[PDB]
Amino acid sequence: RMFKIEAAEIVVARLPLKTHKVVPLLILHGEGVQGVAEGTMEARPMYREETICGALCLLRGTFLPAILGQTFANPEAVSDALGSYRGNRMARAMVEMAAWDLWARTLGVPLGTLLGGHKEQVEVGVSLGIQADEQATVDLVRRHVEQGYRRIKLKIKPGWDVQPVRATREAFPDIRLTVDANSAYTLADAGRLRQLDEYDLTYIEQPLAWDDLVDHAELARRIRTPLCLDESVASASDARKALALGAGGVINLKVARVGGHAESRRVHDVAQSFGAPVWCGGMLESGIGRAHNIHLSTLSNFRLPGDTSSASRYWERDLIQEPLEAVDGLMPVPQGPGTGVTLDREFLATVTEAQEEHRA
Amino acid sequence: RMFKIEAAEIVVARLPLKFRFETSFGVQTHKVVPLLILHGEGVQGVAEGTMEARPMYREETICGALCLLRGTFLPAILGQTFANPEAVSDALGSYRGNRMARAMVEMAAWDLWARTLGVPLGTLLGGHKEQVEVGVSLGIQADEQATVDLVRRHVEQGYRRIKLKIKPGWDVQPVRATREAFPDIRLTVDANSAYTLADAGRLRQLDEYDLTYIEQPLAWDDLVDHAELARRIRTPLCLDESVASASDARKALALGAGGVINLKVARVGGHAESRRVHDVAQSFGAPVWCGGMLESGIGRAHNIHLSTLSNFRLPGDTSSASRYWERDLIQEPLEAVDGLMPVPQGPGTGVTLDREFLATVTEAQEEHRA
Amino acid sequence: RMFKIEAAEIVVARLPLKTHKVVPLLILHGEGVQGVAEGTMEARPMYREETICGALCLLRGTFLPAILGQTFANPEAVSDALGSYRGNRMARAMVEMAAWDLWARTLGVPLGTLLGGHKEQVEVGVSLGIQADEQATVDLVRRHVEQGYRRIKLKIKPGWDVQPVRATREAFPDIRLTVDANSAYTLADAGRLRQLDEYDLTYIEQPLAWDDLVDHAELARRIRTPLCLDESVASASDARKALALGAGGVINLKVARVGGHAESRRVHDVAQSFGAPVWCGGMLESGIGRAHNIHLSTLSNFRLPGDTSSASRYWERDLIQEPLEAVDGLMPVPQGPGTGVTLDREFLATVTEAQEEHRA
Amino acid sequence: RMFKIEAAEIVVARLPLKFRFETSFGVQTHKVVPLLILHGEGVQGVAEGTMEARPMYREETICGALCLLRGTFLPAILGQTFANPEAVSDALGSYRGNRMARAMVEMAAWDLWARTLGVPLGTLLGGHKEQVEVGVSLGIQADEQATVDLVRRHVEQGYRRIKLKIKPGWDVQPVRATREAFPDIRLTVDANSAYTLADAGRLRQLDEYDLTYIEQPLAWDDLVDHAELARRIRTPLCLDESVASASDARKALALGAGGVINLKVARVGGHAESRRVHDVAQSFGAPVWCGGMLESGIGRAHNIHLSTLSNFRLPGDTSSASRYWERDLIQEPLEAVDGLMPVPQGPGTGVTLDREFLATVTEAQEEHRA
């Protein structure tokens, strides 16, 4: 039956990379269980508009006081209890996703199962930064093809796009190959991107402005490579508009970016209704975040590999007890109720920069 | 955790109606109710099929659906173990069409799954309304005024929308007389896909009587003509028959074929696909409302639970069971007061077969096992 | 003058292939003659929505009781006597096509002549399944080019499309070559299908969903090869919509799929009014069905070869007395009133699994 | 089985009219009737040509058509054997235009073929109505009121549509006075291609008088301007002159140049092509109706038989022969009561030349042989 949110902890961690990374966590306590979720906003607004400082204000000033001590039928009811506030989808995702975790756990059901997925494993890809020259790009691609990754993503930028891609396709005629245009382009560049079409990329990711759909739709008419939207799809209706304007053919789906699991299933379902695929984006998540992504990825319109590769690629040691390791490009769904992972409270303590508990 | 479908009953019943339901495709005075009961994990899931004896509203038949259940769907799931209702649906291969047949299996599985968890069906689907707004659809009328009297009767019960079944040679009159006597109600017409683009003039001045929508004026399988008609009139169009899937809903809305969808859970292949239709509509800014097929309390209760989702923004066809049946097939009454229908309490549908009463109106019954 | 339908037989046959095939037949008796038609629905709904079990219910429960003992001016009058029922075009085609056969026979006129055709022979093509590799595809194509077939159709699927087609066109630069994409594709694949354009295929058949027109219209804008619609054209207005949306340029016309001869002539005429060709699809028909198809194919907008090849390709022995054998890619129209063929009642008896007669 | 065209007569007759037919392209008080009679297999087929002495309604002339018949079409078919009317049509080479000339040959062949089979023409074409709804078109009026009196006269006979021939400087007045006295009839205007896009204002407020359509307001050969005018007004447009083939019909409807087609059998080149026009329109959801050209009973009877097809959903111009002729060229009367015209009984057209009477109104006559 229903659930009472009794308490909430905010823990801010400074987690060392394999130079640290600040990881905000929300823990929601109720019915003898807890749900845990990870904030993916940055210290400064670089990938998008939200920041850690601004999100925590909203959490402890508005969102938490709205739900603490209330009783809820499902996580959708929890999201609704905060519907009058604009944007801040990543802040809201912290509450929403912890609630899914919590809800799934009062039921004894894995999270992906509840969302309607039934994959036990999910295909993963790897992303590659800009390298010094062509053969260094090919050498690093060759390494990752051999590890079994099922899609290779190249970061490109004007003056360095056709060359790395030509070199790679030449060495690797058949692999699934994509590029990240990282909003580095303008419509002026359409001729430079037309040159990528003969290399049969699965898609080009967000070539133009992060908040644009209209110009992408225009660029899509000028090149044959499908466009993939990332930062400009913050909701189901963004997804609907993007696909209907022809701004892209593929969506990079980041769960916190669109406000959590329920909106994400919506985006996934809208995309599917247009026969467009989604795939799971990543944001250097700790195991909390990584585990949420994997569970969402089990949904059936996730037909392209996702950025939920091995935790060991990123961390010396993760905040959770479970290792999340991909093998031959497949990531197993962590077993258990909810996310199927468990915070290591003693280790987290050693890397906690700040924490607080709010009650009733 | 996971569930094993151990056995299945098909039970076909017949219930005398209480009113005479006249539609553009004919008059109906009784109703045949095919039930599928799924058994596993010490509970059961029950679903009602909405296909007809003959293909009048749409393409499926009870006869065609049953042998598909017997020879294909049931053999594919009996003795199998599933993580969720979507996995059950997945196991019914790539068979084309036959959405209502699939819906019987899919919806029974949702009821069984929820009962294993002990949660209301609607809650699992993401809805959190405790009650749902309802209107009434009223069949075709003997005369130009027996219409208004059947109307008054319903405006007085607080039904939140009045829907008039209409027909070629009987459409502007019944609405005329109705908007005459009740100038301010939410009012709409069905129009059972009985028209063509030809009749666009005839349907144009219905623009006057401020209807919330006109429901399925053109071919049951059309989207493109509807898009054109939408451009030749002010009253929004509502699609019923035309939308049998979430991609159908997407095309309809992308084309501008309607601005409203009548979502019938079994027509689209069940709860998951109805939730997708609902989400797709929402994403276009188009509301849905819950259509009805004169269901017994099994179907009506599945409907009520789906209707708890937040894009069900207009009143549905889910009125009081006592309007239809001297005695329903379930123990609980499903009654609306003031145009609100409360969500039947309990796990899954929150309703229960009256096995004793059902036995006396049963005319066919089989048991299938692993 | 007019005609009274006095009786109707349903015969269900189990006909051995050259593993059997179930063949439902309807025989309509009136005015001292009979008309015979063949159901092309399957045991399970795989090519489309209808099944043998569901069609026979409709026949013996609804359609037959509606026409038995009535008098009719033409087959259009017969179809009309069942107009209030939705879909089930193949079930309806059984009644409609037998009625054409019956009507044509009370007149002493060949069926194609009545429909307005005047070809005495019709060009035929051959369809090829997926083969193991390129040269096995080319060897089998070479065989069929030599037998005189006038169009070659390859089944393709993602990962096996450009290779068989490249190999074939290379060996056979000038033959009429088409592919069956068997609804195996998505809009995501438009780049893979663009790659077929340089091989000058006459058309690509139904690449996307079986019930879609809108997405096909979209795909048609992305490739140069004409699209051919099959399962998504169930009527004259489907045909009109398909050609008007630009969903395709060619229609695969299957007579039972659209409800029989009269609707088919409509589809043929609508297509023609858009200057688009039709061609005769096939469904592994016995000689009854094969004979109906050949008569319809004699119409003048059937400008591409049809799948009404030799009966001996499919059956040890056919249900009819007449051999239907193509020679050098040409199939002669069977001589006689109506379909110009005759059931072998003694042989059919040996392979009858069920039969029944309904009267007045 | 097959038929041999053994011989052919061309007979040109002239019949005094009974009313004066004023159109935008002039007034008509007599009518010249070119007949073609085909002979084979001990029966005959008769067709009436609808081209004029001078090219006023459209481009063909009786003179031009006859020498085309003499020097080309007839030589191509005489002594030949054909399976059906479509084969006859096929044998008339690739000659461009001249649809009415072709129609004389094609329609005579349909009448002969049907008679060889002993079946009604309409039955062979797929029609199964036993009677057909008809309206009347009324010529241009002396005054703003001699209009209404000629109208009343016709509303009283139960004609199912009233059609007013109109003209530049005489259009809103005649309709004004008519809709004044008869507020609820089906009413429409012809408008003989006498306007241009300029006059869109003048034709706009005709929107008011609820006409089912406005017939051919712009150029006789135009589709594109009509499409534009259709977007500047509410009343549906009807095309006549513009549609001379099934691809013309397809373009007109794809462009949105009209929502209704006046199907004139001889204008489009005969029965087969008229059946294609009809089917194409149906496929767009657009109705047709049977236009008329003041035909003798030969033409009127071909018209009635074509009109039995099911997309002839609006009343045609096929009124009673006694409105036109003191004495018709055939033995049978073609009379409508209450706006219904019964299908003349018999094989083919079901009508018969009165050879004796025709002889006295004949002014030209030839015989051509194999």
Amino acid, res. D334 = L
Q: State how far the alpha carbon of A320 is from the alpha carbons of A91, A93, A180, in Å.
A: 22, 20, 30
Terminal C-alpha separation, chain C: 20
> D81-82 and D3-4: which strand pairing?
antiparallel
Gap between the Cα atoms of D69 and D59, Å rounded = 16
Residues of chain C with C-beta less than 8 angstroms from the C-beta of B251: 214
B224 CB within 8 Å of a chain C CB: yes
H or E segment to which residue C179 belongs: strand C177-180
Terminal C-alpha separation, chain B: 20
Nearest beta carbon to residue D285 from set B197, B201, B204: B197
Q: Which of B229, B224, B235, B174 is nearest to B198 (CA)?
A: B229
Residue B143 neighbours by CB under 8 Å, 6+ apart: none
Domain count for chain D, please give it.
2
Domain range enclosing C270: 109-338
**What is the longest distance spanned by two Cα atoms in chain D?**
60
Residues of chain C with C-beta less than 8 angstroms from the C-beta of A277: 186, 188
Asked if D61 and D53 count as a contact pair (C-beta separation under 8 A), the reply is yes
The reply to whether B311 and B243 lie within a common domain is yes
Give the domain CATH number at B55.
Answer: 3.30.390.10
Structure token pair of residue A165: 């891609």
Gap between the Cα atoms of B215 and B316, Å rounded = 13
Strand partners, C125: none
Structure token pair of residue A276: 């467009």
Gap between the Cα atoms of C286 and C308, Å rounded = 11
The reply to whether D34 and D123 lie within a common domain is no
**What is the longest distance spanned by two Cα atoms in chain C?**
61
Per-residue 3-state assignment (H helix, E strand, C coil) for A217-250: HHHHCCCCCCEEECCCCCCHHHHHHHHHHCCCCE
Gap between the Cα atoms of A94 and A202, Å rounded = 32
Gap between the Cα atoms of B9 and B35, Å rounded = 8
Gap between the Cα atoms of C304 and C302, Å rounded = 6
The reply to whether B231 and B334 lie within a common domain is yes
Q: What is the DSSP string of A154-210?
A: EE-BTTBSHHHHHHHHHH-SSS-EEEE-TT---GGGHHHHHTTGGG--S-EE--S-T
Gap between the Cα atoms of C113 and D2, Å rounded = 10
Structure token pair of residue A66: 């709205």
Look at B59 and C86 and tell me if their CB atoms are within 8 Å.
Answer: yes
Backbone angles phi and psi of D337, in degrees to 5: -120, 135
Angle between helices A236-245 and A261-273 (to 10 degrees): 20
Virtual CA dihedral for D223, D224, D226, D230, nearest 10 degrees? 130
Asked if D247 and D222 count as a contact pair (C-beta separation under 8 A), the reply is no
Asked if C90 and C40 count as a contact pair (C-beta separation under 8 A), the reply is yes
Gap between the Cα atoms of D250 and D281, Å rounded = 7
Counted residue by residue, chain B has a size of: 370
Backbone angles phi and psi of A164, in degrees to 5: -60, -35
Angle between helices C236-245 and C261-273 (to 10 degrees): 20
The reply to whether A16 and A30 lie within a common domain is yes
The reply to whether B12 and B87 lie within a common domain is yes
Look at D86 and C236 and tell me if their CB atoms are within 8 Å.
Answer: no
B32 CB within 8 Å of a chain D CB: no
Asked if B140 and B165 count as a contact pair (C-beta separation under 8 A), the reply is yes
Q: State how far the alpha carbon of B26 is from the alpha carbons of B21, B23, B221, C58, D346, in Å.
A: 8, 5, 19, 18, 37
B246 CB within 8 Å of a chain A CB: yes
Is D165 marked as binding a ligand?
Answer: yes
Backbone angles phi and psi of B347, in degrees to 5: -75, 150
Q: Which of D123, D347, D308, D272 is nearest to C118 (CA)?
A: D272
Look at A274 and B86 and tell me if their CB atoms are within 8 Å.
Answer: no
Structure token pair of residue B138: 């009223």
Q: For D215, which DSSP code?
A: E
Asked if D176 and D202 count as a contact pair (C-beta separation under 8 A), the reply is no
Resolution in A: 2.4
CA angle A62, A65, A71 (to 5 degrees): 130
Beta strands in B221-353 (DSSP E): 237-239, 260-263, 288-290, 340-342
Gap between the Cα atoms of C186 and C2, Å rounded = 51
D259 CB within 8 Å of a chain B CB: yes
H or E segment to which residue D168 belongs: none
B/e letters for A6-17, b = 16+ CB within 10 Å, e = fewer, are ebbebbbbebee
Structure token pair of residue B144: 């130009």
Gap between the Cα atoms of B347 and D210, Å rounded = 58
Asked if D190 and D164 count as a contact pair (C-beta separation under 8 A), the reply is yes
Counted residue by residue, chain A has a size of: 360
Residue C90 neighbours by CB under 8 Å, 6+ apart: C39, C40, C41, C48, C50, C55, C256, C257, C259
Nearest beta carbon to residue D286 from set B198, B201, B204: B198
Q: Please count the other Cβ atoms lying within 10 Å of the Cβ belonging to residue C134.
A: 17
Is D190 marked as binding a ligand?
Answer: yes
Please report where in the chains the tokens 């703003």 appear, as a residue. Answer: D144
Asked if B116 and B105 count as a contact pair (C-beta separation under 8 A), the reply is no
> A7-16 and C121-123: which strand pairing?
unpaired
Is B167 in the active site?
Answer: no
Q: Please count the other Cβ atoms lying within 10 Å of the Cβ belonging to residue C172.
A: 15
Gap between the Cα atoms of A289 and A38, Å rounded = 5
Per-residue 3-state assignment (H helix, E strand, C coil) for D289-317: EECCCCCCHHHHHHHHHHCCCCCECCCEC
Gap between the Cα atoms of C360 and C66, Å rounded = 10
Terminal C-alpha separation, chain A: 20
Residues of chain B with C-beta less than 8 angstroms from the C-beta of C211: 96-97
Calculate Rg over the CA atoms of chain D.
Answer: 20
C-alpha count within 13 angstroms, C-beta hemisphere, residue B143 = 3
Gap between the Cα atoms of D338 and C291, Å rounded = 47
Gap between the Cα atoms of D363 and D365, Å rounded = 7
Strand partners, A128: A154
Asked if D100 and D60 count as a contact pair (C-beta separation under 8 A), the reply is yes
Structure token pair of residue D150: 């000629």
Q: Which of C320, C353, C326 is nearest to C338 (CA)?
A: C320
Chains that touch C (3 or more CB pairs under 8 A): A, B, D
Strand partners, A33: A30
Q: Please count the other Cβ atoms lying within 10 Å of the Cβ belonging to residue B54.
A: 18
Gap between the Cα atoms of D246 and D248, Å rounded = 5
Q: Which of A322, A306, A317 is nearest to A121 (CA)?
A: A306
The reply to whether C115 and C67 lie within a common domain is no
Q: Which sign, positive or negative, has the C-alpha torsion C341, C347, C349, C355?
A: negative
Backbone angles phi and psi of B333, in degrees to 5: -80, 140
Q: Which sign, positive or negative, has the C-alpha torsion A245, A248, A251, A254?
A: negative
Backbone angles phi and psi of C220, in degrees to 5: -60, -25
Gap between the Cα atoms of C303 and B281, Å rounded = 43
Residue A227 neighbours by CB under 8 Å, 6+ apart: A203, A204, A205, A206, A207, A216, A219, A220, A247, A248, A249, A250
Q: State how far the alpha carbon of D283 is from the alpha carbons of B258, B357, D158, in Å.
A: 21, 50, 31
Asked if D38 and D110 count as a contact pair (C-beta separation under 8 A), the reply is no
Annotated binding site of B for Mg(2+): 190, 215, 240
Asked if D134 and D318 count as a contact pair (C-beta separation under 8 A), the reply is yes
The reply to whether B340 and B225 lie within a common domain is yes
Q: What is the DSSP string of B287-300?
A: -EEE---S--HHHH
Gap between the Cα atoms of A8 and B188, Å rounded = 48
Gap between the Cα atoms of B283 and B310, Å rounded = 12
Structure token pair of residue A277: 């695929």
Asked if C271 and C251 count as a contact pair (C-beta separation under 8 A), the reply is yes
The residue of chain A with its CA nearest to that of C159 is A174
Look at C272 and D119 and tell me if their CB atoms are within 8 Å.
Answer: no
> B131-133 and B340-342: which strand pairing?
antiparallel
Q: Which of A327, A329, A292 is nearest to A110 (CA)?
A: A292
Give the three-class secondary structure for A92: helix
Count interface pairs B-C at CB distance under 8 A.
80
Q: Please give, rounded to a whole number of angstroms, the shortest distance from the CA of B298 to a CA of chain A.
A: 22
B/e letters for D300-330, b = 16+ CB within 10 Å, e = fewer, are bbbbbbbbbbebbbbbbbbbbbeebbeebbb
The reply to whether A69 and A150 lie within a common domain is no
Residues of chain D with C-beta less than 8 angstroms from the C-beta of C240: 280, 283-284
Nearest beta carbon to residue B126 from set A76, A110, A239: A76
The reply to whether A208 and A275 lie within a common domain is yes
Gap between the Cα atoms of B185 and B163, Å rounded = 11
Residue B367 neighbours by CB under 8 Å, 6+ apart: B7, B8, B9
Q: Which of D303, D297, D306 is nearest to D318 (CA)?
A: D303
Calculate Rg over the CA atoms of chain A.
Answer: 20
Amino acid, res. A189 = D
> D187-189 and D162-164: which strand pairing?
parallel
Gap between the Cα atoms of D38 and D20, Å rounded = 32
Gap between the Cα atoms of B139 and B134, Å rounded = 17
Strand partners, B367: B9
Gap between the Cα atoms of A228 and A250, Å rounded = 5
Is B264 in the active site?
Answer: yes
Virtual CA dihedral for B263, B264, B267, B269, nearest 10 degrees? 80
Is D41 marked as binding a ligand?
Answer: no
Strand partners, D115: none
The reply to whether B161 and B291 lie within a common domain is yes
Backbone angles phi and psi of B200, in degrees to 5: -65, -25
Give the domain CATH number at A284.
Answer: 3.20.20.120
Look at B197 and D286 and tell me if their CB atoms are within 8 Å.
Answer: yes
Gap between the Cα atoms of B263 and B244, Å rounded = 9
The reply to whether B192 and B303 lie within a common domain is yes
Asked if B55 and B61 count as a contact pair (C-beta separation under 8 A), the reply is yes
Amino acid, res. D154 = H
Asked if A235 and A259 count as a contact pair (C-beta separation under 8 A), the reply is yes
Give the three-class secondary structure for A334: coil
Please report where in the chains the tokens 């017409």 appear, as a residue. Answer: B189
Virtual CA dihedral for B51, B54, B55, B57, nearest 10 degrees? -70
Asked if D10 and D34 count as a contact pair (C-beta separation under 8 A), the reply is yes
Residue A284 neighbours by CB under 8 Å, 6+ apart: A21, A314
Q: Which of D216, D153, D164 is nearest to D186 (CA)?
A: D164
Q: Which of A250, A242, A248, A233 is nearest to A303 (CA)?
A: A250
Structure token pair of residue B89: 């649906």
Asked if D312 and D287 count as a contact pair (C-beta separation under 8 A), the reply is yes
Edge-first strand listing for the sheet containing A352-359: A33-38, A20-30, A7-16, A352-359
Question: What approach was used to elucidate this structure?
Answer: X-ray
B/e letters for A212-250, b = 16+ CB within 10 Å, e = fewer, are bbebbbbbbeebbbbbbbbbbbbbbbbbbbbbbebbbbb
Phi-psi region of B201 (alpha: psi -120 to 50; beta: other; left: phi over 0): alpha
H or E segment to which residue B305 belongs: helix B297-306
The reply to whether A198 and A321 lie within a common domain is yes
Phi-psi region of A104 (alpha: psi -120 to 50; beta: other; left: phi over 0): alpha
Asked if B87 and B110 count as a contact pair (C-beta separation under 8 A), the reply is no
Strand partners, B134: B316
